Design a protein around this ligand. Structure first.
Ligand SMILES: CCCCCCCCCCCC(=O)O
Ligand SMILES: CCCCCCCCCCCC(=O)O
Ligand SMILES: [Cl-]
Ligand SMILES: [Cl-]
Lengths: 152, 152
């Protein structure tokens, strides 16, 4: 599984606007196509007062880019949420957030960033985090693509 | 461009059987689909006595895995061949070979290995080599997939 988790995570401080700067997955089929199952682009995190996590994302399907609203239910553990588990690996709230989704084992991780900008330090932390994980596909987006619906 | 090249390359010593262990590209569309243009799997390098390079590869197209024979013409420079330029970055002849293809700028690099085995040292050299290059997609294959036509 994923052996890395943010201690003392303040879910309220991750609210707002994020960009899916990089994505990686255990299996090529999870991200290879615009419509692959883990090819989802984060737009906004809406934490509830009850401590759950409403996610706004983009997902390409039936040939166009759909906006989708998902709920990740809090758990026993603070850096873990359920839909499929969502684990928050690391974040500084103001610049970057790393997270992984795992089922059952299918696994996908992203480097979220606050601005439409290539952040090398945050890409570095993502790479370090991935070293320990059995990834077979990695994608990254350029600033033009970050400002486009479904990163086209 | 690519700023890395094997000094003193003995083209005759790269003959024989190779496996496409990892691939990376400047643009997602160059490797994302089974039929993407730089998604080609090396099977065998046949150097000519004239010093050219006959390549046997697999390429998925019109829904099946085709065997294709290509000629890379030698140039002024020994670690450079022409079809699109092919640059040999590094090789130890017995275990791994790193190479890049560039046009015009579209760029794709592979980590070839001699055996159907995950070679971490060779994946490390590939990563180091890629750091200096503007890659946005990376793929890697497992030993089951290395023994299959078109790595399925
Ligand atoms: C705390 C960060 C929340 C991470 C956002 C995850 C959004 C996608 C989760 C499930 C993706 C899917 O529906 O395939
Ligand atoms: C010296 C190593 C030779 C490298 C093998 C390159 C094979 C593919 C080159 C062109 C690929 C294509 O046809 O798209
Ligand atoms: Cl729980
Ligand atoms: Cl020449």
């Amino acid at each position: 599984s994923v052996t890395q988790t943010m201690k003392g995570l303040d879910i309220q401080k991750v609210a707002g606007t994020w960009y899916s700067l990089a994505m990686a997955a255990s299996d090529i089929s999870l991200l290879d196509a615009q419509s692959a199952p883990y090819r989802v682009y984060v737009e906004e995190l809406k934490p509830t007062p009850e401590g759950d996590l409403e996610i706004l994302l983009q997902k390409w399907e039936n040939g166009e880019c759909a906006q989708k609203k998902i709920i990740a239910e809090k758990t026993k553990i603070p850096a873990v949420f359920k839909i499929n588990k969502v684990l928050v690996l690391d974040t500084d709230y103001k610049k970057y957030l790393l997270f992984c989704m795992e089922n059952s084992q299918s696994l996908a991780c992203q480097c979220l960033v606050r601005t439409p900008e290539v952040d090398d330090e945050a890409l570095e932390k993502f790479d370090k985090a991935l070293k320990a994980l059995p990834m077979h596909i990695r994608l990254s987006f350029n600033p033009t693509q970050l400002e486009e619906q479904c990163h086209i």
